[PDB]
């Protein structure tokens, strides 16, 4: 096995600590401190107001009649009620599973019965798509804003006292977080996140002397990712509590609201994903606004390439910007460097660098062999970080986490000798056309490079002749008319003859995951 480490050392990691025992260990030190900012509203939590009432939710939570190991399901925007019901959780030894709170009724449903929750927490507008299930099932509904006839409301549970949490002893392996992922291979799978996983991933990114990601409590992080998935949910709340920062809530993405919160709150640290970035590259009233409070500009979760990297760095040169590559599997498994306390220097396009008290490897698919640096191959992990396993799903288990503990990503990607991790595609998106394979994230890219597209995407096409052939999906820039064989053409002068786009059909929205991945297969399905 050729194995890859971090450019950082390891370092020390209490995942003995229950979640919540780790992510306010240091609490004393800025418990007045702004913890929770709403800001559509404008209301502030200080670190002993969430503590308080994370408390005061467990407590109530447990008069409920959640015990350890019981599930609740989180269906919420970002709000501080979100954060109170997952700390809440956490001080009973109990799960919250989290879902997308714009789902189907049939999606809700779907998770609500696979995580056998006890409790939907939610908002009133939602209920009709759970009731009938909840009532026919002995499911509770608590809604944080009114209360439905058949449901509570929130404040039944902050309305408990602190110091009636029963006692418990949690396990390092007890499941805390149950985040649902279709990732890796199949229909959506419960993701068990232990208080031992958690705790390693948060510590890998924000401790030790030189952290991978400086963030300390003076900064003030933006939280516009949704908390449903693992990104926000772990690099920007967990860790943002971890090391005692400022989170600014926003519930919605829209960009007049992102830039004035960014200058309103003076924001240093902006967690993003590649449809933010794109919007704050073509968007002309970015410059209309003070953005110099901004000194960590992070993306992740899907394919973002150099140049639309670069466009936006030069939007925020007083900022170190970089990607990390995580899974909801995993956590982050890489970080940017610049990142660091003591930054080191990165190369655009790239996701980061292994996370330290980690290992990777890079697997040939054709021959499982491991591979050396410079050379594409699947991306493997191995380290306390990674899920306990798929909820009731031992087999899909044993098929993605080896008997030696690797984590057999299906993410396609190489190490160069800077140590840095580059992304090419999921193994199965690549388009088979003749014998080639063909990354759609690298013609994505060079269409987001055109000025009058303002977003793209690229699927393959059946095609009788030639089996698959690339086709984009395209959005005009406003105003802008241009034509199908201008997109070809376009592209067909920057690349080889195989990577070239057969079709260019016109829409209106690219279909997209609110964390901010194409949703391929809808545009495959059309
Ligand atoms: C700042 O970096 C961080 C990112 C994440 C992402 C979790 C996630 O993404 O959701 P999931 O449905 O499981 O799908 C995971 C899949 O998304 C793709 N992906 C991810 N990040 C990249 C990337 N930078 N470049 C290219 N592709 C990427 C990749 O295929 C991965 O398996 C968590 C924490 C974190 O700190």
């Given at each position: 096995?050729?194995?890859?480490?971090?450019?950082?050392?390891?370092?020390?990691?209490?995942?003995?600590?229950p979640?919540?025992?780790?992510?306010?260990?240091?609490?004393?030190?800025?418990?007045?401190?702004?913890?929770l900012?709403?800001?559509?509203?404008?209301?502030?939590?200080?670190?002993?107001?969430?503590?308080?009432?994370?408390?005061?939710?467990?407590?109530?939570?447990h008069?409920?009649?959640?015990?350890?190991?019981?599930?609740?399901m989180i269906?919420?925007?970002?709000?501080?009620?979100?954060?109170?019901?997952?700390?809440?959780?956490?001080?009973?030894?109990?799960?919250?599973?989290?879902?997308?709170?714009?789902?189907?009724?049939?999606?809700?449903?779907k998770?609500?019965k696979?995580?056998?929750?006890?409790?939907i927490?939610?908002q009133?507008?939602h209920?009709?798509?759970?009731?009938?299930?909840?009532?026919?099932?002995?499911?509770?509904?608590?809604?944080?804003?009114?209360?439905?006839?058949?449901?509570?409301h929130?404040?039944?549970?902050?309305?408990?006292?602190?110091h009636?949490?029963?006692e418990?002893?949690?396990?390092?392996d007890?499941?805390?977080?149950?985040?649902?992922?279709?990732?890796?291979?199949?229909?959506?799978?419960?993701?068990?996140?232990?208080?031992?996983?958690?705790?390693?991933?948060?510590?890998?990114?924000?401790?030790?002397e030189?952290?991978?990601?400086?963030?300390?409590?003076?900064?003030?992080?933006?939280?516009?990712?949704?908390?449903?998935?693992?990104?926000?949910?772990n690099?920007?709340?967990?860790?943002?509590?971890?090391?005692?920062?400022?989170?600014?809530i926003?519930?919605?993405?829209?960009?007049?609201?992102?830039?004035?919160?960014?200058?309103?709150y003076?924001?240093?640290?902006?967690?993003?994903?590649?449809?933010?970035?794109?919007?704050?590259?073509?968007?002309?009233?970015?410059?209309?606004?003070?953005?110099?409070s901004?000194?960590?500009?992070?993306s992740?979760?899907?394919?973002?390439?150099?140049?639309?990297?670069?466009?936006?760095?030069?939007?925020?040169?007083?900022?170190?910007?970089?990607?990390?590559?995580?899974?909801?599997?995993?956590?982050?498994?890489?970080?940017?460097?610049?990142?660091?306390?003591?930054?080191?220097?990165?190369?655009?396009?790239?996701?980061?660098?292994?996370?330290?008290?980690?290992?990777?490897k890079?697997?040939?698919?054709?021959?499982?062999?491991?591979?050396?640096?410079?050379?594409?191959?699947?991306?493997?992990?191995?380290?306390?970080?990674?899920?306990?396993?798929?909820?009731?799903?031992?087999?899909?288990?044993?098929?993605?986490?080896?008997?030696?503990?690797?984590?057999?990503?299906?993410?396609?990607?190489?190490?160069?000798?800077?140590?840095?991790?580059?992304?090419?595609?999921?193994?199965?998106?690549?388009?088979?056309?003749?014998?080639?394979?063909?990354?759609?994230?690298?013609?994505?890219?060079?269409?987001?490079?055109?000025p009058?597209?303002?977003?793209?995407?690229?699927?393959?096409?059946?095609?009788?002749?030639?089996?698959?052939?690339?086709?984009?999906?395209?959005?005009?820039?406003?105003?802008?008319?241009?034509?199908?064989?201008?997109?070809?053409d376009?592209?067909?002068?920057?690349?080889?003859?195989?990577?070239?786009?057969?079709?260019?059909?016109?829409v209106?929205?690219?279909?997209?995951?609110?964390?901010?991945?194409?949703?391929?297969?809808?545009?495959?399905?059309?």
């Open positions: 096995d050729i194995i890859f480490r971090s450019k950082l050392p390891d370092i020390y990691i209490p995942n003995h600590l979640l919540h025992s780790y992510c306010f260990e240091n609490i004393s030190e800025f418990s007045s401190r702004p913890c900012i709403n800001g559509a509203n404008k209301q502030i939590y200080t670190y002993a107001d969430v503590e308080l009432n994370s408390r005061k939710v467990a407590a109530g939570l008069k409920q009649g959640i015990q350890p190991k019981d599930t609740i269906l919420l925007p970002n709000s501080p009620e979100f954060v109170f019901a997952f700390i809440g959780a956490s001080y009973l030894g109990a799960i919250s599973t989290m879902a997308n709170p714009l789902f189907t009724p049939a999606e809700v449903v998770q609500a696979a995580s056998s929750a006890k409790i927490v939610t009133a507008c209920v009709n798509k759970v009731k009938d299930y909840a009532f026919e099932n002995d499911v509770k509904i608590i809604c944080i804003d009114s209360a439905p006839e058949g449901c509570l929130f404040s039944v549970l902050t309305q408990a006292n602190e009636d949490i029963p418990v002893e949690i396990q390092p007890d499941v805390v977080a149950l985040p649902y992922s279709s990732g890796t291979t199949g229909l959506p799978k419960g993701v068990m996140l232990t208080h031992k996983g958690l705790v390693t991933s948060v510590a890998q990114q924000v401790d030790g030189n952290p991978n990601l400086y963030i300390h409590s003076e900064d003030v992080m933006l939280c516009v990712l949704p908390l449903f998935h693992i990104y926000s949910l690099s920007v709340l967990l860790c943002g509590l971890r090391v005692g920062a400022a989170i600014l926003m519930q919605k993405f829209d960009i007049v609201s992102f830039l004035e919160l960014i200058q309103r003076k924001v240093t640290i902006g967690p993003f994903v590649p449809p933010i970035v794109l919007a704050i590259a073509k968007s002309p009233m970015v410059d209309d606004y003070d953005l110099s901004v000194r960590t500009v992070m992740g979760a899907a394919p973002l390439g150099k140049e639309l990297e670069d466009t936006v760095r030069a939007k925020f040169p007083n900022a170190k910007l970089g990607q990390g590559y995580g899974m909801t599997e995993a956590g982050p498994l890489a970080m940017c460097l610049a990142f660091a306390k003591e930054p080191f220097e990165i190369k655009s396009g790239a996701c980061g660098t292994v996370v330290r008290n980690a290992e990777m890079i697997v040939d698919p054709k021959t499982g062999n491991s591979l050396p640096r410079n050379q594409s191959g699947e991306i493997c992990i191995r380290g306390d970080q990674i899920m306990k396993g798929y909820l009731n799903d031992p087999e899909a288990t044993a098929r993605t986490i080896d008997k030696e503990g690797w984590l057999y990503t299906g993410d396609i990607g190489y190490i160069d000798d800077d140590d840095e991790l580059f992304i090419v595609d999921r193994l199965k998106e690549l388009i088979k056309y003749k014998g080639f394979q063909v990354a759609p994230a690298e013609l994505e890219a060079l269409l987001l490079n055109h009058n597209i303002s977003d793209a995407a690229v699927v393959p096409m059946k095609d009788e002749q030639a089996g698959e052939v690339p086709v984009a999906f395209v959005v005009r820039s406003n105003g802008s008319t241009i034509t199908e064989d201008e997109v070809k376009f592209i067909s002068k920057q690349v080889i003859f195989y990577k070239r786009i057969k079709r260019v059909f016109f209106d929205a690219i279909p997209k995951s609110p964390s901010g991945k194409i949703l391929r297969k809808d545009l495959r399905a059309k």
